[PDB]
Amino acid sequence: TTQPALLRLSDHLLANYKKGVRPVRDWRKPTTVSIDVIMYAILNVDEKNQVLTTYIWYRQYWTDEFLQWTPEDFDNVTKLSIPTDSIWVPDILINEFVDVGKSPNIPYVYVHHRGEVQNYKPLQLVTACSLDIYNFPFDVQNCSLTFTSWLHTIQDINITLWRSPEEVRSDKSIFINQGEWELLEVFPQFKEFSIDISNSYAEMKFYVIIRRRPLFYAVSLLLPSIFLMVVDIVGFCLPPDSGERVSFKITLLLGYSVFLIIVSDTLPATAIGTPLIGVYFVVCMALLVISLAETIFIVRLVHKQDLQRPVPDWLRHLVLDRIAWILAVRGLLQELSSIRHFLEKRDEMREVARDWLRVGYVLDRLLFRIYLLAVLAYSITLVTLWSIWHYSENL
Amino acid sequence: TTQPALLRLSDHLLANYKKGVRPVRDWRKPTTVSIDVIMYAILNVDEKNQVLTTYIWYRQYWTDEFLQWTPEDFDNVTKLSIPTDSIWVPDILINEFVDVGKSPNIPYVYVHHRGEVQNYKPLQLVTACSLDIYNFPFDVQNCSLTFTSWLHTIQDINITLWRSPEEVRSDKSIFINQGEWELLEVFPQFKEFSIDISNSYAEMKFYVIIRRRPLFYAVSLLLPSIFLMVVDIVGFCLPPDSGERVSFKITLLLGYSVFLIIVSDTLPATAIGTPLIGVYFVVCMALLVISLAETIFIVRLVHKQDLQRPVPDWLRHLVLDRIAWILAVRGLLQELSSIRHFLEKRDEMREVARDWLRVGYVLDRLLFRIYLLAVLAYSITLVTLWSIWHYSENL
Amino acid sequence: TTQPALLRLSDHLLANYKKGVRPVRDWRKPTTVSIDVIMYAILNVDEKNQVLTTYIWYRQYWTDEFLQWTPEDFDNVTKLSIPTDSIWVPDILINEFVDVGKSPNIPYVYVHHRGEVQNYKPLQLVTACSLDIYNFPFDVQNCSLTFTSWLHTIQDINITLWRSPEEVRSDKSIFINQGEWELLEVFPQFKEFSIDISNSYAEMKFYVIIRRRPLFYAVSLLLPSIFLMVVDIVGFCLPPDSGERVSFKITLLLGYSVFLIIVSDTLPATAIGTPLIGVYFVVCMALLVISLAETIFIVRLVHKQDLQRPVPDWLRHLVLDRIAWILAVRGLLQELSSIRHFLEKRDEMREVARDWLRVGYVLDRLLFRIYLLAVLAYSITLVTLWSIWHYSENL
Amino acid sequence: TTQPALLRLSDHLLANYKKGVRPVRDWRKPTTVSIDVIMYAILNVDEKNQVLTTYIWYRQYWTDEFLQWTPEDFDNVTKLSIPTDSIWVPDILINEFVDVGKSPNIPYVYVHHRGEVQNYKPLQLVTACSLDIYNFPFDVQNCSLTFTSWLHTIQDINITLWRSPEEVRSDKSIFINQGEWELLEVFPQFKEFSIDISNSYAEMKFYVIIRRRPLFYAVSLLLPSIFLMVVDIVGFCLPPDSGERVSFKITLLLGYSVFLIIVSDTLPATAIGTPLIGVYFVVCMALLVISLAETIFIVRLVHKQDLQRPVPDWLRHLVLDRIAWILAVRGLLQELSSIRHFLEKRDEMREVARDWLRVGYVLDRLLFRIYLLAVLAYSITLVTLWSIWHYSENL
Amino acid sequence: TTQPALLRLSDHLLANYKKGVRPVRDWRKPTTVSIDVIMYAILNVDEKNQVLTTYIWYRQYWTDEFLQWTPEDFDNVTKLSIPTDSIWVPDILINEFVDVGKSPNIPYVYVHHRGEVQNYKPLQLVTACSLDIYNFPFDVQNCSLTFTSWLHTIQDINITLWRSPEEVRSDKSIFINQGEWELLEVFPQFKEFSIDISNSYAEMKFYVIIRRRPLFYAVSLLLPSIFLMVVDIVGFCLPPDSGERVSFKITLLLGYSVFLIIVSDTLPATAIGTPLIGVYFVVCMALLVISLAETIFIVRLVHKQDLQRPVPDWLRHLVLDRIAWILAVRGLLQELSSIRHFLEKRDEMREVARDWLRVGYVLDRLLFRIYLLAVLAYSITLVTLWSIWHYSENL
Ligand SMILES: *[C@@H]1O[C@H](CO)[C@@H](O)[C@H](O)[C@H]1NC(C)=O
Ligand SMILES: *[C@@H]1O[C@H](CO)[C@@H](O)[C@H](O)[C@H]1NC(C)=O
Ligand SMILES: *[C@@H]1O[C@H](CO)[C@@H](O)[C@H](O)[C@H]1NC(C)=O
């Protein structure tokens, strides 16, 4: 007619159309929603409140049996857009979410032909996830998102995947690669959910694989922790007996405590787990404290009237395996002989006070061995963490 | 007829239906809402603002006497879903809440048959609770949630439990066990509420039992506080008199103050209570300060012209119970005898300055006893706190 | 008739009813709103942004002359509930508020009989108040809430109190007593408000009296500040002259600075006032600094060639009131006499360097007096603050 | 008639009334909005994000030519209130704003007579402003608010002031004077805005004058910075040469660094400017560092084998202007003479090591002069800042 | 007619007008939206969450074929404003955004003539961007904003630029120049977007060029880092051998660590990059630590019984290139000769302990060379960063 095609097509469709009833002619046939997920960016991974922020491009389609027309009647048009609030829209929600509402709504949907309705929308999802930092510098996380209908059972709503699973697994078309986390794989999975003997529901789980970039954390933390070899080589060659070691070890302890003072403002906080690097740091702290204490005992003993046991019961264990594994003229001469002792009184002080450096080292040597074993353990665990991080790129 | 069943059933029901009036044919019969609560996760327990964040799956049903139909008239269908905003929905609210609004709405409800209407919805509840941290590492909390109608009295609205109470007590089907707090029991309870002589209301209280996981806090706090035995064994065997103790005790005091500097960033803050562990920490601080002061007095006395009272009035109390519980030739000889005194002047300095180590220990020994009693008290209170924590799993 | 009573009663009332016009038959009679306030909890008192968060149960009623019916016509029912958005609701707002919107709405109101309409609603009020912390540990606050209509004058809207004032003064039926602040009195007051010569408005002020619980702040702050007697008794009996005091006072200054380092994370921050306890703390700091400086001068003078003025002009003021208020044989003997002076050269060093401890104390004694006066002032002001806090419970 | 007056008056007005068209009979006449601004409180001045929070009581009126009636027809009533959402309301917005939405809406407006419509509403405005802290303790700020229509040009909407400008300049009727900032003047101003050659817009700028209260900041910051005279008088009279100054200056440097450690938690942060007081503080820090360094050189030189140049090229400049601006008997006697040198070897050590205190002071005296000039500059700039602050109350 | 023109024109237009259909008579012609962007202010650049906050004045127009009229029929009016919610409005969104919703809506649009509809609105955009701080003090950022339709393809919606590109490039008419960042260029760009073989979309990218103001950061950070020349000139001229250097270098290390303690509260935090200035700071820290260690070895060696290798294998490399690139009378005489050795025993101690200052400097000199090279590198990199910053103003 003279009326333009789109206006009278919308009049023919939307008038005498009841939004709020499931668009099926036979109620025994469930409606099928085919959803798709495209990854855009990873905005934040809190790893203290166990929640991550993500931004996802989302689309889905279903069949609306009451929106059908013959094209050549309405001037041969095969697609139009009508407002979302005037048709039936299913309720698809995420099971795990903390706060949603910063994602806007799109008030337009295509109704292509034969009832094909398509919805395009962005998503600002803040979803709870179980984030572990056991291997902090080299983390690989394994988070899930579940799509389902909160009310409709599987006899009313089915969920299917839009594309083939392989395309969804490797889809990095619009991802931002200038952040901190690197996307690896989005793995879809279908499940039937039921926690009671009456009703069952359809779910579509998406597993998101992310991986940290360790360069920043390596150059900012590991090399100052490589300085344990510096402290070892400055504490080894320096005389272990009374000298400047006590003071210089104290200064290095203050420095290595200032380092962990700075580090605590950068390492993540979590109330259920701690990084293994922190375990190695506190082990190094304990060994430094025991080293300082042992140096204090050795300094004190050989300079404050050493009365150590010559042959105590511990000597047997000391020697069993440690040495294997690791008129007035007469009065004038009398007083001259009496005052001649000043030379001895000036000389016999060092010989008194320089006794037992030999026995003091039996503990410094063992503690040096402990330092080297600790450093070797740190190196091997760092290498194996890097290996586990690097082998995760196969998926 | 030719019209499909669901559309004309919705037309028959919703047309000439007035939302806003209580759906009863006789106004003397109150409507009964049967509610249920399923526990999902404990997102946050603030324990500083006395509020916890929780996520609960919720459902309820009531009877709508104006939504009834004979199935075989409408093509034998016995269930349909209609929008929530087109029927009467009761107002069930939580008495204690700080901020709600991050939980979305579900715009669909089943109207099964004979007026059975079911509502399914998630809940993001941020509810105030009285959280105590007296036994911080081993806490067991006891929080409540109250469901009632804010306007309708008990003559208009009754609240009943959906399932049997035993099922609600032990329902951990969908709980997340990868967090910090562990769920123990959800105990329902019915009460009739009235704060005036005219109106009474129906409530349904739910008591949520949670329990902290102490592993993280134990390995991160207790063992550095186990190092009090390290400080005791390094302060005992080291000479108590003038030597290196003053300085070494000062260094340990700086270290044990750095520890509580770090701890204050991890211990919770509350303006109405403090953990008992903090009480033991400050007691240890006070004892360390008194030890350092006593060492300073002992160092000062025996090296700066000791003029202590030989037999003061305190000697009686010192000995009563402490020792039980715990031509020119003549001038030449004259000047030789005069200058012979240099040996004595060089020798009689140590004997002057090494007087009274015996009396100085009467206080170091007692203070060592005080340290051991404090450590024993710490150990026994830690054991009893763990026992109280472990016996709470029976419920 | 056959139609049930509630439905046709709602039809008779709400149909041909215009929401948006004040429900009076004669426009010269103002409508009267009778409000009531019940106290539930005090969620937060910020005392840095001068705002407090409160939770109040609220109710009010007015007369709607267009909602009237004869009961026995409509099957003898004398109460019903109708949606709030379908009738006229007055605009009652708080004058002082920072952010509202976290309190939900109740979409139901009773219309009892003869036009009696009742509204029940919770309130999440975040209202600005003038909070002072002059007596921080023992605060008693005096905050107001004002209820009025923002547009309607007193010729259109009147505000009256629901119950008698005495009941509102003492109403602690549902208060939570497990928080930090204690409720004392809610005092209603009526006022007529007008800031221009044309229009006047009706207000209903509510004064909320709250009171801090000082136990936590006392046990956490006062006793370490009771340790000023510890520092006084360790600085008094220790020799004031050159010895270990300079160093030990330095150590106590570092400790008493670490204390205020910790305290600054717990004391409240306010840009218009400071607690008097902080004034006493900084006075103690200044006195400690002046003590350390005076000890440095006394140490320096009596050990570095004292050339003080014997009788300067200050001696008169020093003594006026301070002492009241507070062949070759000849050469051989010659060289022997020359070398005999070594005894004097070894002995006359202490006598040179031990001059004037007597004059040094004239300042240490006065400064000790200053410490005791400062401690007495601290004690008396703490006692009077506690007395003012305790006498406030009469109201 | 029998129908009450207000209901049929509202029926006569609102029926057949089209909201959404500008209420003028002739479209060539712009509508005039007469606005007013009343100041209530200044909630926050961020001075780090360059934004302030304000609370303003607001009102405006315009003429609605379609809402007119003869009073004696409708029972002689000359005012009524009708809902805001049923009439035409202009769009008046602030040009500069960061976040609005915490101010509620008032759903009622008076339509007095002959089309006089009045709107009363509160405002929660968070507006960006250029805040400078050059004179932090004594700031006077100069912030603007602009009211205009975002779409309608001046041919459609005009903005006029309700009252006379003088009344708006001095209007402190409802201001809260218990905060931090003091209101001085609200200066209205009219401008015609146009950034293109086609369209012009009408604006009404309001300049808000505020002023800080300096008491808190003075008593909390200036007096500890008055202690520079304390450090000057303790560093002047103390011997400048080797003694206790190096150590005592180090202790004062640690104290004066602890002071600025505390201050950094209270001084405001701004990325475009710094207070001049901070400049004086860092100048004092630099002068203290140079003083400590110069003392170290002087201590080192006169005690470690001084080999300074006697007459270098700098001596000319040193003296030009600085001094103006500022058998066996023979062997027995031989060995006696040889050993007689012990007296000289014991005596000639001080005379060697006490050389050149005279030359060392040439730098300490000059640096003392620098300290006094710095203190004088600090005092004069503080006085002039106070004078500028005090003279701002004339407006 | 008697009815005023605007009311009946609005009646003629809006009645029988269907909002929700694209306003084209022929559906094969896409609608064209001509957009414009005007820059107002840069509120925040987070550079830790990789997001910036911006405020933009925005406008656009399109053609509405169903809103057309002949002017002289409706009393010769050629423009009117009608509510936005009563006509068709396209959906133009930004691809990258984190949170929107603090920008209000303007419920009025001009419909000029022949279907010309204009929309004016402000925008509060919080958009994600890739912010780098490699050259922190002198940053130039390069951020994008993309405008497109989220649903409509290019066959339905086209996007064109309102003005010429040159005007948009240089448009600083209403910019605020009192902030931290300086606007340089807004560069528009058109692109056709398609990530699939079926649908294509039209985009309009806007590149926003901003530039930091370095004055504040220069005066607050660079000059204290210019004090490395102060530390170099106080560590060079001071004797490198045993003396006061160890202690004075320790004090400078504590000062230069306090500086970076203060700096960490002002430097930005980013998990993907670090400023080069921080790299130079940590290099200076490492060199200071190695200097202190080398001084400790040199102090220890020449004072604790030096037993260094005289001619080790390292001597060849030491000398190859380093020196090029950089009765009783007999007994009386016997005892006199025996006691005559006291002079030698008092004299031969310094000569023993003053051995090898010559060899110790071979490392201090090299380390001084390292300091000068580090300072030169710092200066040249600062100059080149300033040059890159200054040359960016050409665009
Ligand atoms: C629609 O298709 C028919 C048959 O294929 C064709 O004749 C007609 O031209 C098409 N519509 C238009 C508007 O061209
Ligand atoms: C409904 O039930 C009747 C009787 O049980 C049965 O005959 C009929 O087939 C059922 N409806 C349908 C659609 O099959
Ligand atoms: C209402 O009151 C009348 C008279 O008191 C009484 O007869 C009647 O039974 C009452 N209504 C009902 C439903 O009982």
Ligand SMILES: *[C@@H]1O[C@H](CO)[C@@H](O)[C@H](O)[C@H]1NC(C)=O
């Ligand atoms: C309105 O004014 C008229 C004339 O002044 C007066 O007679 C009449 O009484 C007034 N209306 C009422 C309701 O009194």
Ligand SMILES: *[C@@H]1O[C@H](CO)[C@@H](O)[C@H](O)[C@H]1NC(C)=O
């Ligand atoms: C509109 O234009 C016509 C012809 O140009 C003119 O005669 C008429 O006066 C104009 N309208 C009005 C209201 O003046």
